[PDB]
Write a protein that binds this ligand. Structure first.
Ligand SMILES: [Zn+2]
Lengths: 286, 289, 252, 287, 241, 363
């Protein structure tokens, strides 16, 4: 929380196109991305956006497919809103935000065109892959959703599912054949996995990467989910306040542009890192 | 626009760029301070089996006969004249409850807060009800300590009109062990602004006025030429603290003068941060001696 | 095993999934059409305010347990419990839920907090309780409208009413925005959307969406279309409230 | 409700009587209280009361689909409940710390020590196996639980009998206690915990502490043992600084104590069998 | 697979009396009052200590004599290869909470911060054996970073017993074998144990061995930790002036 | 140093996951020879000898196949000294339990210098895995690196007029590759011939089952035609001669035709052409399994870590069983009883489970 006069200061700053960090209204801050942090997972990633630190694990397990969709697998999301973020979270107080974020992440992936699940099917109705994604919060410094999305995408990109041949046999005997080639593990495309974008409205001007001090100063925030092409998967609205019908359009256009830029930068970075190799040493928490 | 991503680079520890080899006496818990005939203990130690044993990580300080420790990170312990900046948290029937970087909830008694102008007669129930409409929950006060209770809490007051409630400005929260204990925390810099440096870790940054006690809110705009300076000062303070160096007039003034070439935003990128801090540190060190 | 409900079977799957048929597709219709609406306020007695809304197969109740003791800190609150009856929808779900009920509850809260003015209800929490008896299409919008009616009925202050509207996308080659659809047009759909606004001052209050796909311009057209639908729907609710107030005048 | 506070008078008197090595009721420090083991009518019920602390133990069985990691051996399900009759403070869902520590400790002690044969109780490897649950209930709370809970679980799991079963291929046939004679379990060794209580940071140690002694103690050392001198678990709680020789000595004590308790338990089961072999639905043993 | 080759070596390639290289750090998260990180092999614990601050919702539990320690445990879902859910609220994380709490209430020297919460939090990102000790040690480093007074490094580690010998700082493999594993946490300066957990069957005469072995392993861990802490303090002071 | 090696695994719950283990590369490992200072002089226990003489000095180290097929060429006392590796020993352990046991029982003898060398945990001989190279190739290349390292080490140690190492193969492919890698290398035959010692050295050397058709097809074929059901039975005579009684008497032999029947079952025999007959039948399915708890004893695998243990029932008309119990310490010597649970298409033994113990034999 904070006072009223500080809110006046911040809103007139935005209206003037400056901010306490001396940046405009369409400028993120240096986001430190890393991948392959944890080892026991089939994929992992970490993000440090200003003062918000997110970790993401991805485990590719084997499970029964879903009766309505046996021809392909599924993603599940869990979100540990560890009290390490702000002590006001505990075994019960973080469930709210965790549930909210998980429901969003689902809503981003009832798209059928983001992760080609057909590539995750072994034997329809009999066996399939399951991507258990596990988000882990460690700080809360705003622009939470965008960082979580970027981490999800970096983790997917860094996911390595092994090849398995599940061979049937009579008298109910099933066999799994591995490929002893950890270098020959498959990779799922992310050319459509979308990034979130949180446009918070302050005064009569909209802003991106709404720091806390500015979230408290706002009244509405439009979440958009964009892909590198320019489409808009999801369009949600969050805030205890109102929102005009016209500003929606500006917010959406800005989300489109910012998504283009963001996806370009992320793709370049992660190709770079994949190029380097074990020479990077995987500096994490050290 | 402009967005940038970058991998994390590994730190460069040991601060070898300085090369000091300090002449101090560091310790850690379990360490045994000098055991001698009747040495008095201070904050940062305890006794066991006729042996003075440290309790906290830092450097030991031996005043004439008193042995104390000076940790490197703590929460503001209450002194008796230290100024302070505070964000209010509650409004009890009798007083206000304020949050400093302290181990408890600081207290401002209704008897302490100055009145509009100099209308001083006494405190009644009408004041008890204006207790809210004037000092809203969440506001900020720039006070000085009045006394410290045996339970640890700090009762603070407002000696004059230079203190009281604060305007709009901006704020930063740093560690309290990164502000040199000196006088005149209230500075008014030539840059075009003014700053308040709490004996706690709360720094306040407000544009300096022209008239020269918070009983009115001047919720007017602020010239761009006086908000850019404030933002630059804010980022410069964040730089200083991120490099673990002390904080006071000359330090911030010189980081300012250093961060003119580098624009108002590109001086949080750790490289720029580090080079500015090094320039400032070197010039302080060489000029002072 | 839950020890606060009757011992039933461990698992139980419905028969439909064991069916063998290509379900019937709607076909064609007037995209800018609206279903017949029955809205009445004042149904329930033991509640300070209640409302009931029926639009097609949609059947929703909402009740308002009024102020119950519990500036910017002495500002009111309203906690909303959305809940779909276990006998709605092709499939059965245990009463508790915990996945989508809470999402739609957040939606209701985010769409109601704006309209309601809570400075005049300090130190108080309004318990809004919605109930969805039957799902037949646009559900969250009906729930928003019903909660608005129930509040306006109990006599809590406001700035304007809340009108919702649900849209879907036809997955055909020429995708058109389908207004106020049915559970069939919504399960055989590519994208879905929900607007909710305050028509006097023309301000959105809470919206939501999702898509197998889409694009900026399409979403914008959807938005304006939902706005027009809500405008065309508002008068019904007006008349309903007037009618309930007349009945009150009659009772005494 | 709430527990009545403890007066400084009682506290100081207790600390002094400890300094002087004097208990209250009149026993030494290396002594339990008269423990009684009483049986019920149904195979698997036991009420064990040490002094004033009574605890009930029931053992039940079921057949269920096992868990994939272990499709050969069965299952076992502990649970201890602190009935509000044990003491006022034991409201439901409030004294959860004590429940958690006791249940984890007991699970560990019995399960991981491999006291019973989870393999013997297999019927169809992959489809149907046994499932033995044991519900302990705390009736009166005067002092030492873990010892009572354990003695009860053990007397039960040694005084329980399954409905016999016949099998051929997949054809499984269950039967009633009247058609055949139920079959007992398979135990390898009976562990029973032993509770030590530390006073004055570690200077003094007591056995089988009463409730007050538990209120004026700083630390608790639980030690599980058998008649064959095999540590199964040991745990320190209360935030206390002990040493090595203390645990060594406590172990050399637990040895003798467990030997004696075990002798008693065996005598009790013998007497119960004798009774039922003569007409009578009870069995009683006294320390 | 095997645990002790006839020569004396283990699987990982280390004798019984030694352990794996802990690699740590102090100062991860700045938005807190104290933070740490540790990897005692593949394990990766992460601690946080929100300092002695005010109690809200007083609910009549603010001890007037001493301080109020509230330590929370958590084992991430992706920690083990087998995914699990409900890392908090379980009947095991709460036991770990009790354990950590009764250790640090012993060490943290609360008599100086009465009516105040010391909130300790622990999250385990990766588990490969020795999952409690890594957390104890990370929370210790955290406490220290938060300038909270405390009697001594409360250093913890685990030991085990195989083929008539004692192993130090077990991993998951020999932890899954079912053999006796004894975890503990002691205060080196005095030689006093703050915690002693243990779970499996073994004879009594084979107790002193594993006990002293775990103790010596904890001493070694003490050496490593204190070297880290001294580097940290030295660097900080140098930067001050 | 430190190395993180990953590898995948199939669970017991029909699943796959990943492991990431650590591997410590210690540099304080010993060669086994006293002369090599800078490796440790005072190094007791099993170790080599200063002057060997059967290229007179001639230390030597074999490969897996040699251990697997000529252990007697080594168990013999006519030899004195030899090096043993870690990968070799691990493979021996994985394939044959008795051979591994023998090699260990010999390494325990201070005289026959079977000094072991932990190559995996050494900073120099260790070699990582490479894409496109199976585990067998990994171990082979590791052994070659160890040999080359041994030659260099023992080369710089002294004037080399005192000791020289040898590599031994079984097939000439591996030997020839070794030569092309720049080291000595022999096959066991060449060596055991060159010594012209007593001839004792050469003297000491010189199923997948069919499918099963479901009950539907069996019952359909009996009524419709060919197949016919009957009671299976075996004989104390032979493990292969079996008799089916139809509900007439068929005979059938061979472990295939004995497609997983037991003393008393209900098989669905098919009849073989008259070119083999008195008739000869075959099995393709079971109509009713009819089992019971068989009494017997637990023949264990000497590996004290192994869970799977073999069971010998008393009635000779039953096959041994492959059970999973972990005890294997309290049971050996005490008659138990086991219940059968299956016979998949991969095991010459079925899969059972313990149900109760009775008492030591003889009582
Ligand atoms: Zn050597």
């Amino acid at each position: 929380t904070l006072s009223e006069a500080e809110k006046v200061y911040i809103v007139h700053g935005v209206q003037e196109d400056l901010r306490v960090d001396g940046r405009g209204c369409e400028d993120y801050r240096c986001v430190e991305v890393e991948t392959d942090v944890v080892s026991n997972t089939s994929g992992s990633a970490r993000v440090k956006l200003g003062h918000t630190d997110i970790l993401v694990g991805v485990k590719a397990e084997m499970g029964t497919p879903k009766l309505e969709k046996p021809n392909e697998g599924y993603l599940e999301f869990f979100v540990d809103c560890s009290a390490s973020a702000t002590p006001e979270f505990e075994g019960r107080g973080g469930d709210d935000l965790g549930t909210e974020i998980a429901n969003t992440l689902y809503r981003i992936f009832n798209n059928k065109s983001s992760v080609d699940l057909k590539t995750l099917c072994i034997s329809p109705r009999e066996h399939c892959w399951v991507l258990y994604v596990d988000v882990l919060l460690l700080e809360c410094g705003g622009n939470l959703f965008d960082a979580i999305s970027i981490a999800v995408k970096a983790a997917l990109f860094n996911t390595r599912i092994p090849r398995v041949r599940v061979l049937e046999d009579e008298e109910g005997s099933k066999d799994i054949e591995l490929s002893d080639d950890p270098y020959d593990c498959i990779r799922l495309s992310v050319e459509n996995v979308p990034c979130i974008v949180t446009l918070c409205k302050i005064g009569y001007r909209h802003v991106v990467d709404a720091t806390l001090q500015e979230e408290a100063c706002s009244l509405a925030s439009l979440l958009v989910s964009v892909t590198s092409k320019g489409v808009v998967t999801c369009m949600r609205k969050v805030g205890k306040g109102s929102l005009d019908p016209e500003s929606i359009f500006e917010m959406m256009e800005t989300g489109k542009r910012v998504g283009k830029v963001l996806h370009a930068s992320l793709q370049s970075v992660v190709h770079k890192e994949e190029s380097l190799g074990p020479k990077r040493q995987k500096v994490g928490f050290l | 626009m402009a967005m940038e991503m970058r991998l994390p680079v590994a730190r460069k520890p040991l601060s070898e760029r300085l090369g000091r080899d300090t002449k101090k006496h560091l310790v850690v818990p379990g360490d045994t301070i000098t055991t001698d005939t009747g040495f008095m203990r201070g904050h940062g130690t305890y006794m066991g089996e006729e042996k003075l044993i440290a309790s906290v990580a830092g450097s030991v300080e031996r005043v004439n006969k008193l042995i104390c420790v000076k940790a490197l990170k703590t929460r503001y312990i209450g002194e008796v004249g230290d100024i302070v900046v505070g964000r209010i948290t509650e409004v009890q029937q009798k007083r206000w409850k304020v949050e400093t970087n302290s181990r408890l909830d600081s207290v401002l008694l209704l008897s302490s807060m100055n009145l509009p102008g100099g209308e001083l007669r006494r405190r009644s129930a009408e004041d008890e009800l204006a207790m809210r409409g004037f000092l809203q929950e969440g506001d900020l006060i720039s006070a000085e300590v009045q006394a410290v209770f045996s339970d640890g809490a700090v009762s603070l007051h407002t000696r004059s009109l230079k203190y009281g409630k604060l305007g709009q400005g901006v704020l930063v929260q740093v560690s309290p062990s990164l502000v040199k204990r000196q006088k005149t925390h209230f500075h008014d810099l030539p840059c075009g602004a003014s700053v308040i440096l709490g004996n706690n870790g709360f720094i306040w940054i407000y544009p300096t006025p022209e008239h020269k006690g918070g009983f009115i809110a001047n919720l007017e705009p602020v010239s761009l030429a006086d908000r850019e300076v404030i933002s630059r000062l804010r980022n410069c303070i964040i730089s200083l603290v991120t490099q673990r160096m002390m904080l006071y007039d000359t330090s911030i003034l010189y980081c300012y003068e250093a961060s003119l070439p580098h624009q108002i935003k590109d001086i949080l990128k750790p490289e720029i941060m580090e080079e500015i801090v090094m320039e400032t540190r070197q010039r302080l060190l060489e000029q002072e001696g | 095993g839950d020890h606060r409900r009757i011992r039933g079977p461990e698992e139980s799957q419905p028969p439909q999934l064991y069916a063998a048929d290509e379900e019937e597709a709607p076909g064609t219709r007037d995209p800018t059409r609206l279903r017949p609406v029955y809205a009445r306020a004042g149904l329930l007695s033991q509640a300070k305010g209640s409302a009931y809304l029926e639009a097609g197969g949609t059947k929703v109740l909402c009740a308002v347990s009024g102020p119950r003791q519990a500036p910017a800190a002495l500002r009111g609150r309203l906690l909303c419990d959305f809940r779909r009856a276990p006998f709605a929808g092709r499939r059965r779900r245990a009463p508790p839920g915990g996945c989508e009920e809470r999402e739609l509850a957040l939606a209701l809260q985010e769409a109601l907090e704006p309209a309601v003015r809570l400075g005049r209800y300090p130190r108080a929490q309004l318990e809004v309780s919605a109930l969805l008896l039957e799902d037949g299409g646009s559900a969250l919008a009906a729930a928003l409208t019903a909660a608005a009616l129930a509040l306006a009925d109990a006599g809590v202050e406001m700035y304007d009413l809340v009108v919702g509207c649900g849209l879907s996308l036809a997955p055909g080659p020429a995708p058109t925005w389908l207004l106020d659809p049915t559970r069939l047009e919504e399960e055989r759909a590519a994208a879905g959307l929900t607007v909710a606004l305050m028509p006097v001052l023309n301000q959105v209050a809470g919206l939501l969406g999702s898509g197998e796909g889409g694009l900026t311009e399409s979403w914008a057209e959807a938005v304006r279309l939902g706005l027009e639908g809500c405008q065309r729907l508002y008068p019904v609710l007006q008349q309903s409230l007037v009618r309930a107030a007349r009945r009150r005048g009659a009772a005494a | 409700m709430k527990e009545t506070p403890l007066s400084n008078c009682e506290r100081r008197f207790l600390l002094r009587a400890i300094e002087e090595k004097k208990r209250l009721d009149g026993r030494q420090t290396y002594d339990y209280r008269n423990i009684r083991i009483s049986f019920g009518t149904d195979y698997g019920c036991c009420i064990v009361e040490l002094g004033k602390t009574r605890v009930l133990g029931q053992v039940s069985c079921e057949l269920v689909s096992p868990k994939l990691n272990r499709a050969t051996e069965g299952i076992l399900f502990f649970n201890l409940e602190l009935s509000q009759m044990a003491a006022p403070a034991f409201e439901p869902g409030r004294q959860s710390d004590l429940l958690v520590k006791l249940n984890r400790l007991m699970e560990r002690c019995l399960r991981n020590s491999k006291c019973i044969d989870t393999e013997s109780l297999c019927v169809v490897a992959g489809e149907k196996v046994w499932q033995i649950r044991v519900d302990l209930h705390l009736l009166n709370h005067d002092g030492n639980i873990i010892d009572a809970a354990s003695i009860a679980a053990i007397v039960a799991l040694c005084h329980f009998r399954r409905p016999d079963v016949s099998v051929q291929g997949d054809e499984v046939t269950l039967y009633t206690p009247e058609e055949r004679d139920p079959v007992p379990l398979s135990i390898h060794h009976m562990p029973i915990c032993v509770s030590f209580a530390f006073f004055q940071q570690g200077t003094y140690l007591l056995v089988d502490p009463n409730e007050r002694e538990e209120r004026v103690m700083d630390g608790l050392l639980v030690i599980a043992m058998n008649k064959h001198r095999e540590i199964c678990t040991i745990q320190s709680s209360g935030g206390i600084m002990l040493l090595k020789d203390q645990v060594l000595r406590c172990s050399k004590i637990a040895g003798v104590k467990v030997a004696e308790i075990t002798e008693l338990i065996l005598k009790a089961l013998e007497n119960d069998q004798k009774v039922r072999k003569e007409g009578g639905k009870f069995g009683f043993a006294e320390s | 697979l095997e645990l002790l080759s006839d020569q004396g070596y283990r699987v990982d390639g280390r004798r019984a009396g030694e352990l794996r290289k802990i690699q740590a750090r102090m100062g991860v998260f700045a938005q807190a009052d104290g933070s740490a990180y540790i990897e005692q092999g593949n394990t990766k614990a992460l601690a946080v200590v929100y300092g002695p601050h005010e109690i809200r919702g007083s609910r009549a539990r603010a001890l007037p004599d001493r301080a109020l320690v509230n330590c929370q445990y958590s084992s991430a879902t992706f920690s083990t290869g087998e995914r699990k859910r409900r890392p908090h609220g379980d009947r095991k994380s709460c036991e770990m909470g009790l354990q950590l709490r009764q250790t640090f209430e012993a060490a943290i020297l609360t008599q100086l911060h009465p009516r105040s919460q010391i909130d300790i939090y622990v999250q385990v990102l990766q588990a490969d054996g020795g999952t409690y000790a890594a957390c104890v040690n990370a929370a210790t480093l955290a406490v220290l970073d938060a300038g909270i007074p405390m009697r001594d490094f409360v250093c913890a580690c685990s030991a085990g017993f195989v083929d008539g010998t004692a192993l130090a700082d077990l991993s998951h493999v020999e932890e899954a074998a079912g053999g006796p594993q004894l975890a503990l946490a002691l205060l080196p300066a005095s030689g006093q144990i703050a915690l002693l957990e243990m779970d499996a069957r073994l004879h009594e005469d084979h107790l002193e061995r594993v006990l002293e072995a775990a103790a010596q392993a904890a001493r070694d861990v003490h050496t490593l930790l204190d070297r880290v802490v001294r580097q940290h303090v030295r660097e900080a002071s140098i930067l001050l002036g | 140093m430190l190395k993180s090696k990953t590898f995948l695994k199939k669970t017991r719950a029909g699943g796959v996951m990943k492991i990431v283990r650590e591997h410590y590369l210690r540099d304080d490992i010993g060669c086994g020879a006293p002369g090599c200072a800078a490796c440790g002089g005072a190094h007791e226990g099993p170790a080599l000898e200063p002057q060997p003489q059967d290229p007179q000095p001639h230390y030597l180290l074999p490969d897996t196949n040699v251990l697997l097929h000529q252990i007697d060429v080594l168990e013999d006392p006519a030899i004195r000294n030899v090096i043993v590796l870690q990968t070799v020993l691990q493979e021996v352990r994985n394939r044959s339990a008795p051979v591994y046991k023998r090699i260990r029982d010999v390494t325990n003898n201070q005289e026959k210098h079977f000094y072991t060398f932990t190559n995996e945990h050494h900073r120099e001989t260790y070699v990582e895995q490479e894409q496109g190279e199976n585990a067998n190739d990994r171990n082979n290349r590791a052994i070659r690196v160890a040999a080359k390292w041994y030659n260099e080490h023992l080369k710089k140690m002294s004037a080399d007029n005192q000791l020289q190492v040898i590599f031994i193969t079984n097939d000439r492919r591996n030997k020839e590759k070794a030569i092309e890698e720049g080291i000595p290398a022999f096959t066991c035959e060449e060596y055991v011939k060159s010594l012209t010692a007593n001839p004792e050295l050469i003297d000491r050397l010189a199923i997948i089952f069919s499918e099963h058709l479901p009950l539907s097809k069996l019952q359909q074929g009996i009524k419709s035609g060919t197949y016919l059901q009957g009671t299976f039975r075996a004989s104390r005579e032979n493990y292969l001669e079996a008799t089916v009684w139809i509900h007439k008497e068929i005979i059938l032999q061979g472990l295939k035709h004995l497609n997983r029947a037991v003393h008393e079952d209900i098989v669905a025999v098919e009849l073989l052409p008259k070119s083999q007959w008195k008739p000869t039948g075959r099995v393709v399915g079971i109509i009713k399994r009819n089992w019971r708890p068989y009494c017997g004893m637990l023949s264990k695998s000497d590996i004290k870590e192994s869970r799977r243990h073999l069971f010998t029932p008393a009635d000779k008309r039953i096959p041994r069983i492959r059970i999973e119990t972990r005890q294997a310490s309290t049971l050996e010597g005490r008659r138990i009883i086991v219940a059968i649970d299956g016979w998949p298409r991969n095991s010459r033994y079925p899969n059972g489970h313990f149900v109760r113990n009775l008492g030591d034999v003889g009582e």
